[PDB]
Write a protein that binds this ligand. Structure first.
Ligand SMILES: CCCCCCCC/C=C/CCCCCCCC(=O)O[C@@H](COC(=O)CCCCCCCCCCCCCCC)COP(=O)([O-])OCC[N+](C)(C)C
Ligand SMILES: CCCCCCCC/C=C\CCCCCCCC(=O)O[C@@H](COC(=O)CCCCCCCCCCCCCCC)COP(=O)([O-])OCC[N+](C)(C)C
Ligand SMILES: CCCCCCCC/C=C\CCCCCCCC(=O)O[C@@H](COC(=O)CCCCCCCCCCCCCCC)COP(=O)([O-])OCC[N+](C)(C)C
Ligand SMILES: CCCCCCCC/C=C\CCCCCCCC(=O)O[C@@H](COC(=O)CCCCCCCCCCCCCCC)COP(=O)([O-])OCC[N+](C)(C)C
Ligand SMILES: CCCCCCCC/C=C\CCCCCCCC(=O)O[C@@H](COC(=O)CCCCCCCCCCCCCCC)COP(=O)([O-])OCC[N+](C)(C)C
Ligand SMILES: CCCCCCCC/C=C\CCCCCCCC(=O)O[C@@H](COC(=O)CCCCCCCCCCCCCCC)COP(=O)([O-])OCC[N+](C)(C)C
Ligand SMILES: CCCCCCCC/C=C\CCCCCCCC(=O)O[C@@H](COC(=O)CCCCCCCCCCCCCCC)COP(=O)([O-])OCC[N+](C)(C)C
Lengths: 610, 70
C-alpha cells in the first residue's frame, strides 16, 4: 500500500491518488512516511516535477487537514546521514515552484528549518552545494527574489539565523558570490535587498565560527564585487542611512567629496579588511581588490606619512651595513677608531637575524606556496645574518674556514640590496620581472643546459686516451671536470678552440663538439632570449599590480613595526555621518566626473570645501 | 598558445601506449560503476562527471535519481 502511493506521486496522477487514499484512510499515524530516510509522501512528489504536481499536493494537504494531523506532515525532516534537515520547503524552493512554496508556507511549513546534512555542507566543493542551510538562504542563492520577499515578511522567519558553520544569509551570499563571467550580479542585488529589508546592523556585525564578518569574509574569500559594493555602499533614502558606508559630504558641480567609513577597514581593529586583503595569499584576484576606493587611498596616505621614511631609513642602514662589512672584510690584516665598524656589523647582523627569526617563526606555510614571490627575501636576509654571525663565531677561535662565510655574506648582502628597488616604481617593475624571469625560463634553460653539458662532457672525456711519458698538457679535455669546464668556457665564448687533442677518434670528437655548439649556442641560448621576450610581454601589464602588492606588504609591515605609541596617525577626522554617537572614522575622497549631471540630494554639508 | 594541446596529445599517446603495455589481466581498472540508464539489461559502463553553472536556473525534469550524491 505504501509503495503504491509512493510510486504514483512521481507520475502525477490526479484521479488514482484519491482512489488510493480513500481505502488507505479507511484501513485504520505512521502511514505516509518512508522508514529508511524519512521521505514523506508530501515531499516525495516535489522532486518529480509534473504538470499535475500542484493538484496532488493540494489533495495531500487537504487530506492532512481533514484528519487533524498537519504538524508532523509538513514539518517532516529527513533521516539519512547525508540529509539531516532537508524538508518539503527546501526542495520546493529549489524546484522554482513559488506557488507550491507559498502553499506550503501558508500551511505552516518550517521556515527556520536547518538543512544541516553532510551533502549540504561540502568539503571539496565537488560533491555538494553550500547555500546557507536555510530555505531563505537557498532562495537568495538560487536567484529567486520573489521567494525571498515572500519569506522575509512572516511571523516566525529568523533572518539572523546562524547555521552549523556560524554563517548567516549575508555570509552565505558572500561565499556563493562569484565574478560576472561565471554568474550574474544577482547576489549583490540579493545582498542589498535583504540588508535593506532587515534594516539593522546586526547582520553585518555578526561573526561566524571563524572570527569574520561578512565584510571580512568577502575580503578573505576574494569576492571583489561584493567588497566593492559594501565599501562604497551609499543609501539615498533617509529612513535607513546609518547602514551606508560612504557618505557624500558635498558635491559642487562635477566635484564631490565623499566620506568613507573605516570601522573594520583601517588596520586598527586586529583583523581588518586592509590587512586581510594584503597579507592573505590563497586568492588570485588580490591585485584588483586593492584598487577599491578606501583601501587604495589608505595605502597611499600611509606610504606618504610614515612608510616612506621608514623604507628610506631601512635602505640607508642596510646600505651602510653592507658598505662597512665589505670594508672591514676586504681590508683585513691578512684599530680603535675602526673597531666601531665591525662592532656595528655584529650588532646589525644580530638585529637582522632576530628580526627574520621572529618573522619566520610566525610565517604561514601558505605564503611559502607559489614560487617564492613573497618570502624569498626573508630567507636570504636571515641567511646573510647567520653567515655574518658564523663568520665572527669562527673568527673568534682558531678556525681557518671563516673567510668563506664572510665572503659569501658580502656577495649575498650586495645581492640582497636589490630588494630595496621596490621603493621606486620603475626599479620595482625591474625587480619583479627579474623574479618571474629567473624562476620561469632561466631554471628550465639551466636544467636542459646542465643535462647537455654533463652528457657531452662525459662523452668527450671518454674519447681521449692517457697522456704519454713526459707529457701532461696533451688535451684540455682530460678528466670529466676538465671536459665540463672546457664546454662551459666554450659556451661563454672564452678561450681558444683547439681540435688537436689526444683523441683516438678526432672526427667523432669534432662531431660531438659541433653538436654541443649547435644545441647550446644556436638553439638553447637563443631560444631563451626568445622566450623571456614572451615573459616580459605578459608581465609588462602584470607589473603595476604585483609591485603595488609588495609595496602594500612593506607598508603594513612597517606599520606593525611601530610601537603602541607613535601610531596615532589615523586617516582623517572623526565626524562621518549624522549618527549622534560613535562617529568612528572617515576618509575624504574627491571625485570628478562630467557625465552624470544630476541634482545632488544625498549631500551632507551645504558649504563645500573646508 | 599551441602548447597546452600538443603536449596533452603526447600525454594521451603515452597513456594509451602504457595501457596497451598492460597484460590481459591487471587491466580490470575500468572507469566507473556499471549502472548507466533505466534499461533493464546490459547497463554497460558509465562515467560520473559533475558540472557547476549559475546561469540556467531551470526546473530539473530529466533527473534520474531523487537522492543526490553518493
Ligand atoms: C650558458 C652557460 C652559463 C652557466 C650555466 C650553468 C653552468 C654550470 C656548470 C659549471 C661547471 C663549470 C666547471 C666546474 C669545475 C670543474 C673543475 C674543478 O675545479 O672541479 C672541482 C669541482 O667544481 C665544482 O664543483 C664547482 C662548484 C660548483 C659548480 C656549479 C655552480 C653553480 C652555481 C649556481 C648558483 C645558483 C644560480 C645562480 C642564479 C640564481 C673539483 O675541485 P677542484 O677545484 O678541482 O679541487 C678540489 C679541492 N681540493 C683540492 C681541496 C680537494
Ligand atoms: C633563485 C632566484 C633568486 C631571485 C628571486 O627569488 O628574486 C628576488 C628578486 O630578485 C632580485 O631583485 C635580485 C635578487 C638578488 C640576486 C639573486 C641571485 C642570488 C645571488 C647570490 C650570490 C651568491 C651568494 C650565494 C649564497 C647561497 C625575490 O623578489 P620577490 O619575490 O619579488 O620579493 C618578495 C619577498 N618579500 C615580500 C619578503 C620582500
Ligand atoms: C609580522 C612582522 C612583525 C614584525 C615586528 C617586529 C618587532 C617590532 C618591534 C620593534 C622593532 C623596532 C624597529 C627595529 C629596528 C631594527 C630592525 C632592522 O633590522 O631594521 C628594520 C628597519 O626598521 C626601521 O627602519 C626602524 C624604525 C623604528 C621605528 C621608528 C619609525 C620612525 C618613523 C618616523 C616618520 C616621521 C627592518 O627593516 P625591513 O624593511 O623590515 O628589512 C627588510 C628585510 N626583509 C624584507 C626581509 C624584512
Ligand atoms: C642611489 C643608489 C645608491 C647605491 C645603491 C646600491 C645598491 C642598489 C640598491 C638600491 C638602490 C635603488 C633603490 C633605492 C631605494 C631607496 C630609496 C627610496 O625608497 O626612496 C623612496 C622614499 O625615499 C624618499 O624619498 C625619502 C624621503 C625623506 C625621508 C626622510 C627620513 C628622515 C622614494 O619613493 P618614490 O616612489 O620616489 O616616492 C613617491 C612619490 N613620487 C612618485 C611623487 C615621487
Ligand atoms: C637551485 C635551484 C632550484 C630551485 C627550485 C625552485 C622551483 C621553482 C619552479 C618554478 O619556478 O616553476 C617554473 C617552471 O620550472 C620548472 O619547470 C623547473 C624544472 C626544474 C629546474 C629547477 C632548477 C634547476 C637548476 C639547475 C639544476 C614556472 O613554470 P610555469 O609554467 O610558470 O608553472 C606555472 C605555475 N607556477 C607559476 C605557480 C609555478
Ligand atoms: C644539480 C644536480 C645536477 C648535476 C650535478 C652533477 C651530477 C654528477 C656529479 C658527478 C661529479 C663527480 O665527482 O664526478 C666525478 C666522476 O663522475 C662521473 O664521471 C659521473 C658521470 C655521470 C654523471 C654526470 C654525467 C651525466 C649527468 C646527467 C644529468 C644529471 C642531472 C642534471 C639535472 C639538471 C669526477 O671525475 P673526474 O673529474 O675525472 O675526477 C678526477 C679523478 N679521476 C680521474 C681519478 C676520476
Ligand atoms: C654510428 C656508426 C659508427 C660510427 C663510428 C665510425 C667509426 C669511427 O670512429 O669513425 C670516425 C668517427 O665516426 C664518424 O665519422 C661519425 C660521424 C657522425 C655519426 C652520426 C651522424 C648522424 C673517426 O674515425 P678515425 O679513427 O678518425 O678514422 C676512421 C678510420 N677509417 C676511415 C679507416 C675507418
Amino acid at each position: 500500500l505504501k509503495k503504491r502511493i509512493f510510486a504514483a506521486v512521481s507520475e502525477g496522477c490526479v484521479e488514482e491518488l484519491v482512489e488510493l487514499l480513500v481505502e488507505l484512510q479507511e484501513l485504520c499515524m505512521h502511514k505516509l512516511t518512508a522508514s529508511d530516510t524519512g521521505k514523506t509522501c508530501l515531499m516525495k512528489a516535489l522532486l518529480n516535477i509534473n504538470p499535475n504536481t500542484k493538484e496532488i499536493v493540494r489533495i495531500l494537504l487537504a487530506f492532512a487537514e481533514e484528519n487533524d494531523i498537519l504538524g508532523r506532515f509538513i514539518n517532516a525532516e529527513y533521516t539519512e546521514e547525508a540529509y539531516e534537515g532537508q524538508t518539503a520547503l527546501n526542495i520546493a524552493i529549489e524546484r522554482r515552484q513559488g506557488d507550491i512554496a507559498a502553499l506550503l508556507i501558508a500551511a505552516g511549513a518550517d521556515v527556520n528549518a536547518h538543512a544541516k546534512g553532510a551533502f549540504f555542507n561540502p568539503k571539496y566543493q565537488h560533491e555538494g552545494f553550500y547555500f546557507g542551510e536555510t530555505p531563505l538562504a537557498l532562495a537568495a542563492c538560487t536567484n529567486q527574489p520573489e521567494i525571498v520577499q515572500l519569506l522575509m515578511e512572516h511571523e516566525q522567519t529568523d533572518i539572523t539565523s546562524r547555521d552549523s558553520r556560524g554563517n548567516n544569509i549575508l555570509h552565505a551570499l558572500v561565499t556563493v558570490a562569484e565574478d560576472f563571467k561565471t554568474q550574474n550580479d544577482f547576489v549583490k542585488r540579493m545582498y542589498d535587498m535583504i540588508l535593506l529589508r532587515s534594516g539593522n546592523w546586526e547582520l553585518e556585525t555578526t561573526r561566524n565560527n571563524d572570527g569574520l564578518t561578512p565584510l571580512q569574509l568577502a575580503a578573505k574569500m576574494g569576492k571583489a564585487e561584493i567588497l566593492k559594493y559594501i565599501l562604497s555602499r551609499e543609501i539615498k533614502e533617509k529612513r535607513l542611512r546609518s547602514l551606508s558606508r560612504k557618505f557624500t559630504d558635498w558635491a559642487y558641480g562635477p566635484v564631490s567629496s565623499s566620506l568613507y567609513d573605516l570601522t573594520n577597514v583601517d588596520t586598527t581593529t586586529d583583523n581588518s579588511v586592509l590587512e586581510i586583503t594584503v597579507y592573505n595569499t590563497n586568492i588570485d584576484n588580490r591585485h584588483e581588490m586593492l584598487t577599491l576606493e578606501p583601501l587604495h587611498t589608505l595605502l597611499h596616505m600611509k606610504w606618504k606619512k610614515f612608510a616612506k621614511h621608514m623604507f628610506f631609513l631601512s635602505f640607508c642602514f642596510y646600505f651602510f651595513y653592507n658598505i662597512t662589512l665589505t670594508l672591514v672584510s676586504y681590508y683585513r690584516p691578512r684599530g680603535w677608531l675602526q673597531l666601531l665598524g665591525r662592532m656595528f656589523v655584529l650588532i646589525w647582523a644580530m638585529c637582522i637575524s632576530v628580526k627574520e627569526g621572529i618573522a619566520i617563526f610566525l610565517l604561514r606555510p601558505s605564503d611559502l606556496q607559489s614560487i617564492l614571490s613573497d618570502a624569498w627575501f626573508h630567507f636570504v636576509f636571515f641567511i646573510q645574518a647567520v653567515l655574518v654571525i658564523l663568520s665572527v663565531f669562527l673568527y673568534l677561535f682558531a678556525y681557518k674556514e671563516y673567510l668563506a662565510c664572510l665572503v659569501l655574506a658580502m656577495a649575498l648582502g650586495w645581492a640582497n640590496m636589490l630588494y630595496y628597488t621596490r621603493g621606486f616604481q620603475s626599479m620595482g617593475m625591474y625587480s619583479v620581472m627579474i623574479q618571474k624571469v629567473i624562476l620561469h625560463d632561466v631554471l628550465k634553460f639551466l636544467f636542459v643546459y646542465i643535462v647537455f653539458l654533463l652528457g657531452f662532457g662525459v662523452a668527450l672525456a671518454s674519447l681521449i686516451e692517457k697522456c704519454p711519458k713526459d707529457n701532461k698538457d696533451c688535451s684540455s679535455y682530460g678528466s670529466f671536470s676538465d671536459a665540463v669546464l672546457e664546454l662551459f668556457k666554450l659556451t661563454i665564448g672564452l678561450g681558444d678552440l683547439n681540435i688537436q687533442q689526444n683523441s683516438k677518434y678526432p672526427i667523432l670528437f669534432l662531431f660531438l663538439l659541433i653538436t654541443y655548439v649547435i644545441l647550446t649556442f644556436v638553439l638553447l641560448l637563443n631560444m631563451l632570449i626568445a622566450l623571456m621576450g614572451e615573459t616580459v610581454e605578459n608581465v609588462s601589464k602584470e607589473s603595476e599590480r604585483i609591485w603595488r602588492l609588495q609595496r602594500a606588504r612593506t607598508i603594513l609591515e612597517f606599520e606593525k613595526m611601530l610601537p603602541e605609541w607613535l601610531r596615532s596617525r589615523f586617516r582623517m577626522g572623526e565626524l562621518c555621518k549624522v549618527a549622534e554617537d560613535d562617529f568612528r572614522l572617515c576618509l575624504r575622497i574627491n571625485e570628478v566626473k562630467w557625465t552624470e549631471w544630476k541634482t545632488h540630494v544625498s549631500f551632507l554639508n551645504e558649504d563645500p570645501g573646508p
